[PDB]
């Protein structure tokens, strides 16, 4: 269907505990494929998905270099940041960076991203037009004048519109078996009496890829959304995902309820109910 490639960078300062920590990962849709950790024996860009490892030595060395450089450029970033907010050098602070592209099935840009957060809140972000910036406060505006002088936005547009998209096409192609073979969810319904008079019905969905999924409960053909509890979609540990939906029902009326599952890897949406034994 539609796809995206994202990078996520975390830079954490650590007072009296040496240089800061840098951990960044790369994702094509919901599949991690690359990692970099500055505390590893000898820091380098690493493969975290099968498909990405046939790539030649240049790819790896090039990215290792870009990660190594970042360690220094964002060392000063955390320095400057702590300066803009008149913060003690004894505290620990966090700089996060995310950027990437969204391509429709057709493979053309839907929108590019380049955002930053300091200590947990939006700091500065490139807008959808890819030519303007949105600063969270007057400190970020300092950054905004620096990058506007450097014609930074003009540089990112070249990457997001060029490099990002092309490497996304390439990746979705190399591992098209892992990346565009949608895994249908294994579903079932469980029953759990809360009391004498009330029972919980749990609609399960396991082993599905990608993460996007819709689980809804109905009392007769009628939706029950804020009668339904949903858990956050969680990783199974093997690249597939899991999720469940529960509703508390009056005992004896269990069969008035049905569960409806929607997922990309399914021919047609499923409809389940509880099996009395």
């Amino acid at each position: 269907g539609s796809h995206s490639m994202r990078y996520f960078y975390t830079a954490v300062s650590r007072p009296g505990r040496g240089e800061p920590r840098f951990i960044s990962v790369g994702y094509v849709d919901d599949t991690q494929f690359v990692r970099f950790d500055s505390d590893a024996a000898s820091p380098r860009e690493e493969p975290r998905a099968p498909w990405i490892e046939q790539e030649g030595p240049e790819y790896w060395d090039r990215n290792t270099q870009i990660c190594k450089t970042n360690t220094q450029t964002d060392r000063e970033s955390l320095r400057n940041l702590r300066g803009y907010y008149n913060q003690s050098e004894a505290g620990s602070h966090t700089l996060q960076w995310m950027y990437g592209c969204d391509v429709g099935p057709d493979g053309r840009l839907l929108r590019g991203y380049n955002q930053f957060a300091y200590d947990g809140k939006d700091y500065i972000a490139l807008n959808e037009d890819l030519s303007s910036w949105t600063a969270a406060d007057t400190a970020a505006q300092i950054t905004q004048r620096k990058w506007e002088a450097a014609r930074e936005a003009e540089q990112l547009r070249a990457y997001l519109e060029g490099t990002c998209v092309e490497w996304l096409r390439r990746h979705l192609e190399n591992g098209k078996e892992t990346l565009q073979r949608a895994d249908p969810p294994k579903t079932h319904v469980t029953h759990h009496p809360i009391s004498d008079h009330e029972a919980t019905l749990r609609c399960w969905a396991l082993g599905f890829y990608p993460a996007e999924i819709t689980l809804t409960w109905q009392r007769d053909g009628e939706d029950q959304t804020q009668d339904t509890e949903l858990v956050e979609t969680r990783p199974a540990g093997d690249r597939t995902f899991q999720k469940w939906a529960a509703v508390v029902v009056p005992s004896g009326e269990e069969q008035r309820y049905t569960c409806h599952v929607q997922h990309e890897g399914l021919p047609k949406p499923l409809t389940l109910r509880w099996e009395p034994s």
Binding site: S92, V231, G237
Partner: protein, 99 residues
């Protein structure tokens, strides 16, 4: 800005006593990234515990999957201990094979 981790304790495959499986503890929505997570068997720390690479969500919150190999029994108790700056004391969530 400090966010408290959400915690989910579950297994990779439907639990069948005796059969081999994977025990997962998924922590999400926390800030900062410093987090201390352990898997416990009958109140005691299991040592060979791996965890995925630190990633984050739209809202900049962190999430990690801590896992280990294990085998389900009817009487053995499994839990996840999580300590974070936003918790006065460590949070423990017992593994329920129905959630």
């Amino acid at each position: 800005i400090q966010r408290t981790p959400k915690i989910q304790v579950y297994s990779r495959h439907p639990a069948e006593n005796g059969k081999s499986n994977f025990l997962n503890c998924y922590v999400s929505g926390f800030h900062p990234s410093d987090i201390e997570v352990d898997l416990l068997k009958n109140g005691e720390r299991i040592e060979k515990v791996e965890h995925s690479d630190l990633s984050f969500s739209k809202d900049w919150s962190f999430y990690l999957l801590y896992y280990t190999e294990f085998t389900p029994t009817e009487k053995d108790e499994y839990a996840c201990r999580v300590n974070h700056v936003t918790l006065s004391q460590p949070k423990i969530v017992k593994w329920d094979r129905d959630m």
